[PDB]
Amino acid sequence: VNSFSGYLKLTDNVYIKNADIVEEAKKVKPTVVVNAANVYLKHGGGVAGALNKATNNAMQVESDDYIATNGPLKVGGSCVLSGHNLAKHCLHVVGPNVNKGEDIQLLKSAYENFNQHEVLLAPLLSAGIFGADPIHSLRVCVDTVRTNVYLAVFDKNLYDKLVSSFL
């Protein structure tokens, strides 16, 4: 039993809710919140820009030190950093950005990072400003993640379409 509330159950291990991941994180304080990161951990917009703003830019400060030490992530890769005031940990995961020409096949690799964590709050990777089809992102998620994932979809209209079209 965990403290996630109001989610529709899609499969044995995948749940979905129309919610602002920032507000969800602030309420639940999950062990892991997933960020829709880029390789440079530049949290300018989308989910990443919103999560960083909620940390008062502390996420960006930590991220800049990480990059200065380690260099950029791989597309499809991840790193674990602090969750600041939102969660114990933030798993920064880089899904392909279609608006940069990045291979959508790397989306499965991106979701594989979730399997290193027993429970996660997460957005749909590569959705929104990353330019992938969120219906496709959901299918890959369900077919790849085996740990317990609670998906927050900010857009209510998108939430309804994902549920109604889910196979």
Ligand X SMILES: O[C@@H]1CN(c2ncnc3[nH]ccc23)C[C@H]1F
Write out the residues near ligand X by the rule CB under 6 A.
20-22, 46-47, 50, 123, 127-129, 152, 154-155
Smaller CB separation from ligand X, 33 or 69: 33
Smaller CB separation from ligand X, 70 or 85: 85
CB of 127 to ligand X, least distance (A): 4
The residues near 7 (Cβ < 8 Å, ≥ 6 apart) are 15, 16, 17, 150
Smaller CB separation from ligand X, 36 or 71: 36
One-character DSSP codes across 35-69: EE--TT----SHHHHHHHHHTTTHHHHHHHHHHHH
CB of 101 to ligand X, least distance (A): 18
CB of 133 to ligand X, least distance (A): 12
20: helix, coil or strand?
Answer: coil
CB-closest chain residue to ligand X: 128
79: helix, coil or strand?
Answer: strand
Smaller CB separation from ligand X, 39 or 70: 39
CB of 66 to ligand X, least distance (A): 22
33: helix, coil or strand?
Answer: strand
Task: In whole angstroms, give the CA distance from residue 9 to residue 100.
Answer: 33
